[PDB]
Amino acid sequence: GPLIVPYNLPLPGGVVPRMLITILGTVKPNANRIALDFQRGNDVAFHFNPRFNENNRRVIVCNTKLDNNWGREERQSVFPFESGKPFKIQVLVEPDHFKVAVNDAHLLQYNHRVKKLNEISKLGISGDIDLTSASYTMI
Ligand SMILES: CO[C@@H]1O[C@H](CO)[C@H](O)[C@H](OCc2cn([C@@H]3O[C@H](CO)[C@H](O)[C@H](OCc4cn([C@@H]5O[C@H](CO)[C@H](O)[C@H](O)[C@H]5O)nn4)[C@H]3O)nn2)[C@H]1O
Numbered sequence: 248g249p250l251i252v253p254y255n256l257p258l259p260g261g262v263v264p265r266m267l268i269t270i271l272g273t274v275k276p277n278a279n280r281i282a283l284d285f286q287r288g289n290d291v292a293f294h295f296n297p298r299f300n301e302n303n304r305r306v307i308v309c310n311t312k313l314d315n316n317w318g319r320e321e322r323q324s325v326f327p328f329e330s331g332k333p334f335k336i337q338v339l340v341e342p343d344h345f346k347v348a349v350n351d352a353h354l355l356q357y358n359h360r361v362k363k364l365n366e367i368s369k370l371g372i373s374g375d376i377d378l379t380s381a382s383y384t385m386i
């Protein structure tokens with residue numbers, strides 16, 4: 248039913264273009280944050296971080312963490328999440344970027360900074376959600 252957050256989903260042999268990762272959940276009421284962390288060991292290859300109240304604004308912050316240092320942030324002000332509401336996040340790995348759609352609407356893409364895609368072998372899912380489902384498939 249509801250998975251335990253923080254949740255770790257192993258990605259056997261890392262990611263690869265045409266790999267589709269689907270996260271189903273519901274945002275808690277008065278949520279503060281969501282985070283998806285595609286990890287290469289201790290490094291975070293792709294950090295996807297909806298923030299519900301940063302100086303009274305809603306923003307999605309994306310970044311990469313290498314040897315414990317966060318890089319240059321990429322910010323998107325389109326913010327499809329709402330507290331209390333069910334969502335679907337789809338992360339499709341493409342040759343040059345992660346492509347993210349929420350609720351079947353394209354949201355953003357994030358260019359690969361970590362190059363060893365087949366070593367990005369785990370997805371951490373955390374934040375103020377009830378997590379229903381997390382899975383992957385090759386399309
Ligand atoms: C148009 O221009 C802009 O107009 C704006 C109008 O409000 C502001 O004036 C802008 O400058 C101020 C400003 C401040 N911040 C951030 O605000 C934050 C709290 O919401 C923190 O204080 C941030 O610094 C500490 C911090 C670090 N991290 C880590 O970031 C990682 C991803 O990179 C992961 O998410 C980690 O998990 C997370 O810990 N988190 N917090 C701070 O950098 N963003 N912008 C200005 O540029």
Ligand SMILES: [Cl-]
Pocket residue numbers: 360361362363
């Ligand atoms: Cl790399």
